[PDB]
UniProtKB/Swiss-Prot annotation, chain A:
The keyword Hydrolase does not apply. Its main location: endoplasmic reticulum. One of its GO terms (cellular component) is endoplasmic reticulum membrane. Present with 8450 molecules/cell in log phase SD medium. The chain holds residues 23 to 115 of 286 of the full protein. GO terms for biological process: protein N-linked glycosylation. This is Dolichyl-diphosphooligosaccharide--protein glycosyltransferase subunit SWP1. One of its GO terms (molecular function) is structural molecule activity. It comes from Saccharomyces cerevisiae (strain ATCC 204508 / S288c). The lineage of its organism: Eukaryota, Fungi, Dikarya, Ascomycota, Saccharomycotina.
UniProtKB/Swiss-Prot annotation, chain B:
Component of the oligosaccharyltransferase (OST) complex, which appears to exist in two assemblies comprising OST1, OST2, OST4, OST5, STT3, SWP1, WPB1, and either OST3 or OST6. OST assembly occurs through the formation of 3 subcomplexes. Subcomplex 1 contains OST1 and OST5, subcomplex 2 contains STT3, OST3, and OST4, and subcomplex 3 contains OST2, WBP1, and SWP1. Interacts with SEC61. It comes from Saccharomyces cerevisiae (strain ATCC 204508 / S288c). Despite low primary sequence conservation between eukaryotic catalytic subunits and bacterial and archaeal single subunit OSTs (ssOST), structural comparison revealed several common motifs at spatially equivalent positions, like the DXD motif 1 on the external loop 1 and the DXD motif 2 on the external loop 2 involved in binding of the metal ion cofactor and the carboxamide group of the acceptor asparagine, the conserved Glu residue of the TIXE/SVSE motif on the external loop 5 involved in catalysis, as well as the WWDYG and the DK/MI motifs in the globular domain that define the binding pocket for the +2 Ser/Thr of the acceptor sequon. Catalytic subunit of the oligosaccharyl transferase (OST) complex that catalyzes the initial transfer of a defined glycan (Glc(3)Man(9)GlcNAc(2) in eukaryotes) from the lipid carrier dolichol-pyrophosphate to an asparagine residue within an Asn-X-Ser/Thr consensus motif in nascent polypeptide chains, the first step in protein N-glycosylation. N-glycosylation occurs cotranslationally and the complex associates with the Sec61 complex at the channel-forming translocon complex that mediates protein translocation across the endoplasmic reticulum (ER). It comes from the Eukaryota. The chain holds residues 654 to 718 of 718 of the full protein.
From Swiss-Prot, chain C:
It is found in: Endoplasmic reticulum membrane. This is Dolichyl-diphosphooligosaccharide--protein glycosyltransferase subunit WBP1. Coiled coil: none annotated. It comes from Saccharomyces cerevisiae (strain ATCC 204508 / S288c). Present with 14900 molecules/cell in log phase SD medium. Subunit of the oligosaccharyl transferase (OST) complex that catalyzes the initial transfer of a defined glycan (Glc(3)Man(9)GlcNAc(2) in eukaryotes) from the lipid carrier dolichol-pyrophosphate to an asparagine residue within an Asn-X-Ser/Thr consensus motif in nascent polypeptide chains, the first step in protein N-glycosylation. N-glycosylation occurs cotranslationally and the complex associates with the Sec61 complex at the channel-forming translocon complex that mediates protein translocation across the endoplasmic reticulum (ER). All subunits are required for a maximal enzyme activity. Component of the oligosaccharyltransferase (OST) complex, which appears to exist in two assemblies comprising OST1, OST2, OST4, OST5, STT3, SWP1, WPB1, and either OST3 or OST6. OST assembly occurs through the formation of 3 subcomplexes. Subcomplex 1 contains OST1 and OST5, subcomplex 2 contains STT3, OST3, and OST4, and subcomplex 3 contains OST2, WBP1, and SWP1. Interacts with SEC61, SBH1 and SSS1. The cytoplasmic C-terminal domain contains a functional dilysine-retrieval motif, which is involved in the retrograde Golgi-to-ER transport of the protein. Belongs to the DDOST 48 kDa subunit family.
Amino acid sequence: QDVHVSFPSTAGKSRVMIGKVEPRIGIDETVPTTITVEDPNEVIQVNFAIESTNKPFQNTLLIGLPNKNLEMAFEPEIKDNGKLSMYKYRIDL
Amino acid sequence: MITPLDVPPLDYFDEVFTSENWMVRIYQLKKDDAQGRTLRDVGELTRSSTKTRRSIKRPELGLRV
Amino acid sequence: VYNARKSEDFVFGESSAALLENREQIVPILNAPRTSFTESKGKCNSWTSGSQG
């Protein structure tokens, strides 16, 4: 994560599951944008996207409504071996 | 036969009258606290806790609406 | 408490945020700028998130 790139795989697990997982791209450029992936596994719907251009010190995921100040930050699960570093966010709805 | 280690204290009510032979006890609902905290926390505040010992911790309260 | 007629800045040299209980009496006035966090010299957990402090 220091001198190498990384990969983010936000997984949205759900005991009660009802989701559509839409996406849009209209914002100022932060030099990191990639398309998300999908899956059809049992109770794990991984989403793969590589926006790991810049150097991380903080690495957090905010979930909620920003217009009414309802946010929730989640803890990353980083795995760095050798030169390859990866992230893992686990969201439980 | 009962003992004072029985009869847990009363943190929402307070007695205002008790007859001579202790027949008819009259209690009052004391008003809810001004700072919004529950009255058992006022009761455990004002006594028995905690030997001038503290603890500092992430209070695990969720999120504000 | 205060309503800004126009956009302005408010300086905060070094600060500390507060986690708030969901009581009726508490009147929030200003918010952490939604991209902030807390750190310590010790290896403790982060106190508040971005916009909840």
